[PDB]
């Protein structure tokens, strides 16, 4: 499936239509935007971890004032504002901590720290917020956005713009996305598969060097640059890519 935003609707047990918009990143990260029975929008991440849009929007710093103005229905978002969520929304950090609590489902109050954001960024921002060149292209089209091509990251406007169509499409405005359409696909050739393994090869080399530079430093020696790098990372990860990867097959 190609990166971008995809709109789907599935019937519930009673046949009530439930619409859904899904963000697909450059690495398969799916960010599901759903409308529940009470019209409350939840940025579902896993089968259990459920997070509201306002907490997620204020997690990055979207002030509660501007969220209402940029949508056609400020009332819908304001109706779901419990007095507990408003206090956490009012400050940027309290939204981050509450977002961490709902995303991680961990009992207790986390402390705001630089490592917490970095730990969240690798798990959440690194896997679920980088669209890529292709992902930006589709989002500019499907959400009808005049955003520059070089922006390869999921801009906060896209989420708020997506919620406009998601609620708007519920009232007959637009058509659902065809998931089996070839315009929603991508083809990965040997160019993408060999380049990706090079991403693993060099990341495997830095861990070799880090152990090597630390080992030689503890001996107070001056190591030549050749001896800090061995050929095993590149050679083995390509030797084991053709051996083990299912997409690498023996020529018939």
Partner 1 sequence: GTSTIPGFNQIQFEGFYRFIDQGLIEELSKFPKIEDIDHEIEFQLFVETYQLVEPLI
Partner 2 sequence: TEDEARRRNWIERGWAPWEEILTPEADFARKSLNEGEEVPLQSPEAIEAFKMLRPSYRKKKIKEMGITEDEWYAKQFEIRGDKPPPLDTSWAGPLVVRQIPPRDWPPKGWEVDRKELEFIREAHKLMAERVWLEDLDKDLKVGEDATVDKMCLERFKVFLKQYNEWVEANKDRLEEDSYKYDQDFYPGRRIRGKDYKEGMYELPFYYPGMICEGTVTTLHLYQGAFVDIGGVHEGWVPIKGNDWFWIRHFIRVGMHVIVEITAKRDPYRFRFPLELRFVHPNIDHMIFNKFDFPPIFHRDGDTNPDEIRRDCGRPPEPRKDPGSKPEEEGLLSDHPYVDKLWQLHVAEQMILDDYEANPEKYKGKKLSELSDDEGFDERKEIEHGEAYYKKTKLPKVILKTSVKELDLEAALIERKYHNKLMMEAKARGEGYKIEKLRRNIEMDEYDSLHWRRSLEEREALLRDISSRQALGLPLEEPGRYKPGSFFGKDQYDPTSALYQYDYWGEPKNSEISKQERMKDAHNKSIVGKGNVWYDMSYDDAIKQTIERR
Partner 3 sequence: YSDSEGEMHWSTDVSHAPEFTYSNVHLLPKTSHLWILSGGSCGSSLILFSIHKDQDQMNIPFSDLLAKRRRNRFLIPISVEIPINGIFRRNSIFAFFDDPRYRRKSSGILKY
Q: Does 195 bind partner 1 (CB under 8 A)?
A: yes
Q: Does 221 bind partner 3 (CB under 8 A)?
A: no
Q: Does 225 bind partner 3 (CB under 8 A)?
A: no
Tell me the window of 10-18, 105-113, 153-161, 204-212 that interacts with partner 1 (CB under 8 A). 204-212
Breaks (C-N over 2.5 A) in the chain follow: none
Pick between residue 107 and residue 225 the one whose CB is nearest to partner 1. 225
Out of partner 2, partner 3, partner 1, none, which partner does residue 106 contact, by CB within 5 to 8 A per kind?
A: none
For the segment 211-250, give every residue that binds partner 1 (CB under 8 A). 213-214, 217, 225, 228
Q: Does 150 bind partner 3 (CB under 8 A)?
A: no
Q: Which two tokens stand for residue 162?
A: 């997506």
Tell me the window of 42-50, 115-123, 131-139, 197-205 that interacts with partner 1 (CB under 8 A). 197-205
Q: Does 209 bind partner 1 (CB under 8 A)?
A: yes
Q: List residues near partner 2 by CB under 8 A.
A: 59-63, 66, 70, 117-118, 120-121, 125, 129-130, 145-148, 150, 153-157, 160
Backbone angles phi, psi at 44, to 5 degrees: -65, 135
Pick between residue 156 and residue 168 the one whose CB is nearest to partner 3. 168
How far apart CA 176 and CA 29 sit, in angstroms, is 21
How far apart CA 234 and CA 205 sit, in angstroms, is 8
| Closest approach of partner 1 to the CB of residue 150, in Å | 15
Out of partner 3, partner 2, partner 1, none, which partner does residue 171 contact, by CB within 5 to 8 A per kind?
A: partner 3
Tell me the window of 9-17, 40-48, 168-176, 207-215 that interacts with partner 3 (CB under 8 A). 168-176
What's the chain's length in residues? Answer: 252
- Determine how β-strand 4-11 pairs with β-strand 30-35: unpaired
In angstroms, the Cα distances linking 15 to 9, 11, 54 are 11, 5, 28
How far apart CA 227 and CA 240 sit, in angstroms, is 24
Q: Which two tokens stand for residue 33?
A: 């935007």
x/- letters, 169..188, toward partner 3 (CB under 8 A)? --xxx---------------
Pick between residue 36 and residue 192 the one whose CB is nearest to partner 1. 192
| Closest approach of partner 3 to the CB of residue 147, in Å | 17
Residues that bind partner 1 (CB under 8 A): 189-192, 194-195, 198-199, 202, 205-206, 209-210, 213-214, 217, 225, 228
């Amino acid at each position: 499936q190609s990166p971008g935003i995809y709109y789907q609707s599935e019937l519930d047990h009673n046949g009530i239509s439930v619409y859904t918009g899904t963000i697909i990143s450059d690495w398969g990260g799916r960010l599901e935007l759903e409308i529940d029975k009470k019209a409350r929008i939840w940025a579902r991440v896993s089968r259990k971890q459920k997070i509201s849009i306002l907490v997620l929007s204020s997690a990055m710093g979207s002030n509660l004032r501007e969220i209402l103005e940029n949508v056609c229905y400020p009332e819908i978002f304001l109706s779901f504002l419990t007095d507990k969520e408003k206090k956490k929304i009012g400050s940027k950090e309290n939204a981050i901590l509450e977002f961490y609590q709902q995303f991680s489902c961990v009992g207790g109050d986390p402390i705001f720290s630089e490592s917490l954001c970095k730990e969240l960024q690798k798990k959440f921002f690194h896997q679920r917020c980088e669209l890529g060149r292709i992902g930006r292209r589709n989002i500019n089209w499907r959400l009808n956005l005049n955003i520059p091509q070089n922006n390869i990251f999921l801009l906060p406007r896209d989420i708020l713009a997506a919620a406009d169509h998601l609620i708007g499409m519920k009232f007959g405005m637009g058509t659902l996305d065809d998931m089996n359409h070839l315009k929603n696909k991508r083809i990965r050739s040997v160019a993408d598969l060999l380049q990706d393994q090079l991403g693993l090869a060099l990341a495997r080399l830095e861990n070799v060097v880090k152990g090597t530079i630390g080992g030689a430093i503890r001996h107070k020696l001056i190591p030549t640059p050749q001896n800090l790098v061995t050929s095993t990372p590149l050679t083995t990860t390509y030797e084991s890519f053709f051996g083990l990867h299912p997409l690498s097959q023996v020529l018939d």
